[PDB]
Amino acid sequence: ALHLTRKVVRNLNYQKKLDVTIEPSEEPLFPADELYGIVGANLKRSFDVREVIARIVDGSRFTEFKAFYGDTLVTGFARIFGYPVGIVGNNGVLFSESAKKGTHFVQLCCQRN
Amino acid sequence: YHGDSVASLGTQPDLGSALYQENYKQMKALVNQLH
Amino acid sequence: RNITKVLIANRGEIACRVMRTAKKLGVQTVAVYSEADRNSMHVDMADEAYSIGPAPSQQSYLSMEKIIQVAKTSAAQAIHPGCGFLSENMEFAELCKQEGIIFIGPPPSAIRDMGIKSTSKSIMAAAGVPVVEGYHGEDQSDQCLKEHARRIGYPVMIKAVRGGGGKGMRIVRSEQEFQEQLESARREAKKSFNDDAMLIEKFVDTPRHVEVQVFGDHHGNAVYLFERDCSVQRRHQKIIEEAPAPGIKSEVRKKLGEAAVRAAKAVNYVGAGTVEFIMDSKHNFCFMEMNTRLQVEHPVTEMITGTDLVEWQLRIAAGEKIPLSQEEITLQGHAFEARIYAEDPSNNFMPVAGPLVHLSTPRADPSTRIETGVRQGDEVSVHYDPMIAKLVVWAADRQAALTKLRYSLRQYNIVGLHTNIDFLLNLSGHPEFEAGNVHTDFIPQHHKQLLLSRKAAAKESLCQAALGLILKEKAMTDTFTLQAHDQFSPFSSSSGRRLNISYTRNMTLKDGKNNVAIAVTYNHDGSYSMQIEDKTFQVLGNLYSEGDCTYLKCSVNGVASKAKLIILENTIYLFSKEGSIEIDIPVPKYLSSVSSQETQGGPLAPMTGTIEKVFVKAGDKVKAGDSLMVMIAMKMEHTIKSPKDGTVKKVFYREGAQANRHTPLVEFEEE
Amino acid sequence: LNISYTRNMTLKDGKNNVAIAVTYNHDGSYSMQIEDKTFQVLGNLYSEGDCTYLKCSVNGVASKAKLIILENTIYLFSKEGSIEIDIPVPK
Amino acid sequence: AGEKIPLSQEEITLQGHAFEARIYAEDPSNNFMPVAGPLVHLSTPRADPSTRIETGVRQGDEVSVHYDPMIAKLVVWAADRQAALTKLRYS
Amino acid sequence: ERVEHIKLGGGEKARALHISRGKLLPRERIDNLIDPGSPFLELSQFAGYQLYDNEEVPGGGIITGIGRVSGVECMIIANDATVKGGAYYPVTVKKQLRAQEIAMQNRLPCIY
Numbered sequence A: 001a002l003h004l005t006r007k008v009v010r011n012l013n014y015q016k017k018l019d020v021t022i023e024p025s026e027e028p029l030f031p032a033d034e035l036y037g038i039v040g041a042n043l044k045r046s047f048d049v050r051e052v053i054a055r056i057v058d059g060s061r062f063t064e065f066k067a068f069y070g071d072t073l074v075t076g077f078a079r080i081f082g083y084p085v086g087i088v089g090n091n092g093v094l095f096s097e098s099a100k101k102g103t104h105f106v107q108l109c110c111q112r113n
Numbered sequence B: 001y002h003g004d005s006v007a008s009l010g011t012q013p014d015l016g017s018a019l020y021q022e023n024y025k026q027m028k029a030l031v032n033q034l035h
Numbered sequence C: 001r002n003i004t005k006v007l008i009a010n011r012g013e014i015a016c017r018v019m020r021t022a023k024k025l026g027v028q029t030v031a032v033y034s035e036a037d038r039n040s041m042h043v044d045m046a047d048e049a050y051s052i053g054p055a056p057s058q059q060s061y062l063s064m065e066k067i068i069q070v071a072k073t074s075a076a077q078a079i080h081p082g083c084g085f086l087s088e089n090m091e092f093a094e095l096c097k098q099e100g101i102i103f104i105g106p107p108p109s110a111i112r113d114m115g116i117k118s119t120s121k122s123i124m125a126a127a128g129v130p131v132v133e134g135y136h137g138e139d140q141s142d143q144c145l146k147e148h149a150r151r152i153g154y155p156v157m158i159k160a161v162r163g164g165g166g167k168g169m170r171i172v173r174s175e176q177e178f179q180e181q182l183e184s185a186r187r188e189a190k191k192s193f194n195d196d197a198m199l200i201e202k203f204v205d206t207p208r209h210v211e212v213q214v215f216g217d218h219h220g221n222a223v224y225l226f227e228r229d230c231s232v233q234r235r236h237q238k239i240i241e242e243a244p245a246p247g248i249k250s251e252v253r254k255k256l257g258e259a260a261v262r263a264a265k266a267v268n269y270v271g272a273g274t275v276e277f278i279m280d281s282k283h284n285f286c287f288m289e290m291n292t293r294l295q296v297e298h299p300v301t302e303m304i305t306g307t308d309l310v311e312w313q314l315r316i317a318a319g320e321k322i323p324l325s326q327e328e329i330t331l332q333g334h335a336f337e338a339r340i341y342a343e344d345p346s347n348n349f350m351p352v353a354g355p356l357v358h359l360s361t362p363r364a365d366p367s368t369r370i371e372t373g374v375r376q377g378d379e380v381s382v383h384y385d386p387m388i389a390k391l392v393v394w395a396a397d398r399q400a401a402l403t404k405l406r407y408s409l410r411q412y413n414i415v416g417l418h419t420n421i422d423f424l425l426n427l428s429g430h431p432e433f434e435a436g437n438v439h440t441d442f443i444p445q446h447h448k449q450l451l452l453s454r455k456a457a458a459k460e461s462l463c464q465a466a467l468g469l470i471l472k473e474k475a476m477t478d479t480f481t482l483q484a485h486d487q488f489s490p491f492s493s494s495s496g497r498r499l500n501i502s503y504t505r506n507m508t509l510k511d512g513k514n515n516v517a518i519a520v521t522y523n524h525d526g527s528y529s530m531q532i533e534d535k536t537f538q539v540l541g542n543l544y545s546e547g548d549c550t551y552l553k554c555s556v557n558g559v560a561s562k563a564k565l566i567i568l569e570n571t572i573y574l575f576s577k578e579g580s581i582e583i584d585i586p587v588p589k590y591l592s593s594v595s596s597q598e599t600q601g602g603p604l605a606p607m608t609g610t611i612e613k614v615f616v617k618a619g620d621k622v623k624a625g626d627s628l629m630v631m632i633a634m635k636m637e638h639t640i641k642s643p644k645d646g647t648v649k650k651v652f653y654r655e656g657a658q659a660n661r662h663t664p665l666v667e668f669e670e671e
Numbered sequence D: 001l002n003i004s005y006t007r008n009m010t011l012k013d014g015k016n017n018v019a020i021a022v023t024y025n026h027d028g029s030y031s032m033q034i035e036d037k038t039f040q041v042l043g044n045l046y047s048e049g050d051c052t053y054l055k056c057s058v059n060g061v062a063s064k065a066k067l068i069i070l071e072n073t074i075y076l077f078s079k080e081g082s083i084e085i086d087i088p089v090p091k
Numbered sequence E: 001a002g003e004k005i006p007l008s009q010e011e012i013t014l015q016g017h018a019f020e021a022r023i024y025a026e027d028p029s030n031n032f033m034p035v036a037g038p039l040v041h042l043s044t045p046r047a048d049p050s051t052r053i054e055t056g057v058r059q060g061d062e063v064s065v066h067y068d069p070m071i072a073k074l075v076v077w078a079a080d081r082q083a084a085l086t087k088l089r090y091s
Numbered sequence F: 001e002r003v004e005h006i007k008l009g010g011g012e013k014a015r016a017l018h019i020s021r022g023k024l025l026p027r028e029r030i031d032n033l034i035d036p037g038s039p040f041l042e043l044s045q046f047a048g049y050q051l052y053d054n055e056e057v058p059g060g061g062i063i064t065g066i067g068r069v070s071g072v073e074c075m076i077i078a079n080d081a082t083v084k085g086g087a088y089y090p091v092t093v094k095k096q097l098r099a100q101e102i103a104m105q106n107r108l109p110c111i112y
């Protein structure tokens, strides 16, 4: 039955098509297991979300958007396995500036798909 | 992945069989007439 | 006579061999080919090539008229016959001379004088070369038979002149028992064959075969080229040849050659000749015969002398004198030659026809020569000789040469038909062969050790086979990924990764008749942990390509090794200098034809051959093992036997009919 | 479908126009008739180094030549000889 | 530089026969008139110890009226004069 | 280690009974269905973890995830017959509905 199922799927006449631009993949520049020490299990302590980003994006490359405005929120462009991604991460309490900065960023990503 | 082995149709006809000999002869004449 | 264009009246490796030398010398080359040889390597090797008709050699390569017609049409000044076919045909050599075409070989007189044993022995005896031999006698007087038995010297064998299978044979150890054994043999022969004629052939004690390469010229000057041991033969067929022959002193060989040289001058032989000698355990030698051609095993002579014997044949046929004096000739090192034969040693060395699906070869160096007339994908033919290639090596020492040949044989890979390569590996590693204790009965005497059965594989080999299968799947995944738009998706990896757990795959492999269960665990680092029964192995490796052959580089429990990997149909072939192992991938039942063929009735002809006997009428009750028909193919008798106890519905062939290979012979009533 | 294509092609040897009728056979061979003589020709193009070579059999005789087609001239270089044939230029 | 002759007369020895032929762009039909043109295709016999080709031009080079038009020098070696001549023609 | 326990489904007695009928274990079915060596993204492994007071329902009685079949990403939804005989608990329905929602939003073929 499992062999038959594989044959059925092969006859779906489907081919995947990508709407986004693609670039060659690259591993992050830092080990992922270091996230254990950086983050820990105590939610009262705070850490820089950029450290988490640096260990998951291709080549640890990140273009920050509105870095000095609403600094409690981090937004920027990166790539994961070649796919383009816009990252929004908390770095503190949300403020009016942070919400405005996020709203501006989300419009940018939607415009460019 | 397209490396799966699969079954194939068809069987080898009995060329010696009288039916096959007669059928081949009749169809061949039609094809020659067409040509 | 200026030889600027030569026709090669042969095929396969020997045609390529001659063309190589002709081309180096700047001589234009003309091939001939049958319909079956249209795409053969020698046709390509000679830009000029002509069809000589259908696949049967009697209608193609043995057709003197067609060969002469092509030589005239191509304006070839000379014909090189090679070995076999027309090379020892006196009528063909005289026809070449009548037509003004240079036959590159001995004169028609030398071919005829050597073609008849009694004539050749009489000439050799008159030339000083010894003529002693053990022979059968056609006289049937008890006194005459007894006098001949004394002359041959006891022990002797009495045999019936008619019949086979040991019937009417008696061993006579002394003169006193001769009369009783003769009357016993006669009574049995008369009862079995209605003939009481007895033969008297025996040899008291001369074991081992030695031959000498001799070269002559039109001038009549004659030279020798040391000697070759061809004692390792199966049914007279030479299997391994060596030069020089071991244990023969330089002084003894010099004398051995000189007596042969005088005979060569006596017939003023022109071109290469070989004096075949029988040598005893005391190194006394006697003339057996003279082959009036280039020998198949001439490469072992070339490797120890540094000569090209085909180049000398072309020069001497052009009329030039012998290039080097006997003083100039010098001997360095030792050399060996093994013939690769499309044969099944396990099935009594039956010849096998079929495709060369894989034909990997050892890399060639000046010491290692691959005399190959076939290429991968070539099909061996029922019409022509079954030889696939000949492997020759030269070394400073004979022991080193034996080591090099065995390493080289492992590198040679042949898939698609059975070969004698594993038999040659066992033979070349036999202690008596390593010692140089060879004689003509060597293969019969050591048959038990040379033919080796299969032994169960080690768990490491199974791990390597599983790794090869996994890597083949990974390669297939990469091939699919190449054509996809999502080139870098993590799904295209072959990591077999899971969330918070490890993937363990249950694989089954068949070694011989045994099913082996392997539990493979995909590790995060890319290695594999394989468990077979109670033992665990840490396996890591990759696939790399050298030339056209894929190689598997693996390490099992820290032990690293390299092997050639081929996966054909459901069998995994692993070739390593340690050895070769075949592992079978089980075939799912569903894929196997459901309703598999049943009640099969007709045993198929082993090959295309004449039907010599039919033992079954249109309606006859037969039991399994009842002989139905007898067929002769290339002079080899096969008896067809009843597969079932079913009564015979019909017979598709009658006596004297030629039946094609795998054609139904008998129809059995449905039960 | 149901018929064989015969191409009428003209090549010029020296000052002489030659008409060759080539029938494209189903097997992939070509049957060519020049004047009253019919020739069965089969061939392939293979590359050694930077030179294309033509391996061809005409009436069963097999040969290899280096083929260069430059401008309107076909150049075949063989061990035996070199032949140059011209392709007529349309008005 | 100042070093002595490398080999003594006894050491010098004669082996075989060699022929040298110089290819020229001269056209024999116009009385060996020198010609200057582009070398669209140039090919030579395969190099080996017996066959030595000495050339100053490559395929795609253009011959010029400014200098001598010799295309190349071809050298072949063999045991006897006739065999060397046969190789020269083959080359 | 908690996932390791959930990996065992109903238990040894249930697993032995399941195999005794000639059927493959649910996770072995997925291994054979997807392309050789391809990663499998399992979803909601902890559904039903201590959800019900006295009943243990490893993984909710259903295994869902995304894997590659014949080079195509598909959603695979397999009932775990070793867990309560494959009965549908309230969490089992929710887990399946979540899988279907994922398949529809991403146009992934569904294999049940």
Ligand SMILES: O=CCCCC[C@@H]1SC[C@@H]2NC(=O)N[C@@H]21
Residues within 6 Å of the ligand: none
């Ligand atoms: O016919 C082909 C060669 C081998 C068979 C010939 C047999 S051997 C017994 C008899 N004596 C001969 O000289 N020829 C036939």
